[PDB]
Write a structure and sequence with these properties.
Helices cover 36% and strands 15% of the residues. It is α+β, with helices and mostly antiparallel strands and 327 residues long. It folds into 2 domains: 1-18 and 110-327, Transferase(Phosphotransferase), domain 1, CATH 1.10.510; 19-109, Phosphorylase Kinase, domain 1 (2-Layer Sandwich), CATH 3.30.200.20. It has a 5-stranded antiparallel β-sheet with strand order 1-2-3-5-4, with helices on one face. Strands 6-9 form a two-stranded antiparallel sheet. Strands 7-8 form a two-stranded antiparallel sheet. A hairpin with a 3-residue loop joins strand 1 (33-41) and strand 2. The two termini are 40 Å apart. Bound molecules: 3,4,5,6,7-pentabromo-1H-indazole. Residues 39-40, 47, 60, 62, 89, 107, 110, 112, 157, 166, 168-169 line the site of 3,4,5,6,7-pentabromo-1H-indazole (K6X). The PDB classes it as transferase/transferase inhibitor.
């Protein structure tokens, strides 16, 4: 398998761009940045709103839990490479505690509203708008030879007053090299592509497009998360019970992939459930034929079939957002 677009980005660029292990970090001054309050946590970091004491400007301070050199350089190099791109979080500085060597990444501040309370208040137009801005970020990172590999609402910071969006946490991100076999233990469960769940390692940017489809289905149908699996086997089961097993079987044979016998047993046999079956009274003002056509074009087993970010941005679903932006 290879990506249908941007396959050659890292091939044409100098080795320094993608050879992240050759990076030598340029540490800033820890004392420039003070923690104001904790705003988040995860497996790999704690996150705080802070202040730059020099200019009194707000920032985000991401304090990293103990991390391998190879891995931190990967996140830093990716951040540096993408800094300035549309709707990409801006890494401002990198600093470390002198005693413990605990590193902190310093970002532009974004005045985020919790997706769990934000999303239910979004208008149909709002959803179109924010999904479009998120697509800008993904087309950009893909065009620069990077897969994000952890698209989910938790990684999309939305300042809803300034109508602004940032794709954050490039901790799981990777350079795309044609034919490279990648680790499948990426993304977060509810957003993992079938490729991950069936051990197809030679995946590409299209992975992010499945995750985006899952986020989108969550929004229009008001079903958070959309595919609610308990473990990675059950995740494939949940998907199979919507998309049906025939399409799964065609996918598997195309890539010459066999399911673990135990997984095959769990998946069983299932017919396709039309998207309209998820419509109900709560969500109804959100679920037009344009919404559905677009969602259907994202949520495909076959990664090679899904819309590219560039394509998605042109889908008629977003025609009002483009018209407004053109002005
Ligand atoms: Br970077 C970054 C930014 Br910007 C924001 Br705002 C938040 C929040 Br709010 N939680 N975690 C965050 C991370 Br990581």
């Amino acid at each position: 398998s290879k990506a249908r677009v941007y396959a050659d980005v890292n091939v044409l660029r100098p080795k320094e761009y993608w050879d992240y292990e050759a990076l030598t970090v340029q540490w800033g001054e820890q004392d420039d940045y003070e923690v104001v309050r904790k705003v988040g946590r995860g497996k790999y970091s704690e996150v705080f709103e802070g202040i730059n004491v020099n200019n009194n400007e707000k920032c985000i301070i991401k304090i990293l839990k103990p991390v391998k050199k190879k891995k931190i350089k990967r996140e830093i190099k990716i951040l540096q490479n993408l800094c300035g791109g549309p709707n990409i979080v801006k890494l401002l500085d990198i600093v470390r505690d002198q005693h413990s060597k605990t590193p902190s990444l310093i970002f532009e501040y974004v005045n985020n509203t919790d997706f769990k309370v934000l999303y239910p208040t979004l208008t149909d137009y709002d959803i179109r708008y924010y999904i479009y801005e998120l697509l800008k970020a993904l087309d950009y990172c893909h065009s620069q030879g990077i897969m994000h590999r952890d698209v989910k609402p938790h990684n999309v910071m939305i300042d809803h007053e300034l109508r602004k969006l940032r794709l954050i946490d490039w901790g799981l991100a990777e350079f795309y090299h044609p034919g490279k076999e990648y680790n499948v233990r990426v993304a977060s469960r509810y957003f993992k592509g079938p490729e991950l769940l069936v051990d197809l390692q030679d995946y590409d940017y299209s992975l992010d497009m499945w995750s985006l489809g899952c986020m989108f289905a969550g929004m229009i149908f008001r079903k958070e998360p959309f595919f609610y699996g308990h473990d990675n086997h059950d995740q494939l089961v949940k998907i199979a019970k919507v998309l049906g097993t025939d399409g799964l079987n065609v996918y598997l044979n195309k890539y010459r992939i066999e399911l673990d016998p135990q997984l095959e047993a769990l998946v069983g046999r299932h017919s396709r459930k039309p998207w309209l079956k998820f419509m109900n009274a709560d969500n109804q003002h959100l679920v037009s034929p344009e919404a559905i056509d677009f969602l259907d074009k994202l949520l495909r087993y076959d990664h090679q079939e899904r819309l590219t970010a560039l394509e998605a941005m042109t889908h008629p679903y977003f025609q009002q957002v483009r018209a407004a932006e053109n002005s």
